[PDB]
Design a protein around this ligand. Structure first.
Ligand SMILES: [K+]
Lengths: 8, 102, 107, 8
């Protein structure tokens, strides 16, 4: 997970 | 750097404007150098009429550099390998990479 | 794929096991060959735990676009070079990484 | 799976 980003 | 889908150090808003300018069709994508994380890259992808951003961070294993979007679960030598793989496989992405901003 | 160091063409399965043992039963040692049982398929021959394992690479089609896969289309690749380069960093269905290439002999 | 092969 990365703040500001859609990664999951 | 010489690829059509790579736009260099464009901004996040410029990527949302470029993708929206070409139509908000699922699969439209580009790769940009992140202005927020200067050592990282971003895959900007249109999905469900919405522009989503996927952080590509570099890391090293046995002094060998690789890039990943899932903290090393799936690794690639460069961005061309990452893009070409996800044109055929979804991975952590919600859809396939179909069309790029030329 | 023909210009790669790990591709040995249309050698036999036993031919692949003899070359790998001749170079050393090291984990990660591999080659890619054209299959003699399936003329349209290829094989990734990989040494793991001093045993040579063989993984069938089959061609398939999705709307006029050909791809290669080792898992019935769950993971797809445009050519054999993309398959090898991916599995040099990611295990996938393989028990280890593609670490060392089995070179062709110098005639 | 494919007979003769270690695919799984
Ligand atoms: K910005």
């Amino acid at each position: 997970k990365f703040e500001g980003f859609d990664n999951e | 750097r010489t690829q059509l889908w790579f736009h260099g150090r464009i901004s996040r808003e410029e990527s949302q404007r470029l993708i929206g300018q070409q139509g908000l069709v699922d699969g439209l994508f580009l790769v940009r150098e992140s202005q927020r994380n200067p050592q990282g890259f971003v895959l900007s992808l249109c999905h469900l009429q919405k522009v989503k951003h996927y952080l590509i961070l570099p890391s090293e294993e046995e002094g060998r550099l690789y890039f990943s979007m899932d903290d090393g679960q799936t690794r690639f030598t460069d961005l061309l390998q990452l893009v070409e793989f996800h044109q055929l496989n979804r991975g952590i992405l919600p859809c396939l990479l179909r069309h790029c901003c030329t």
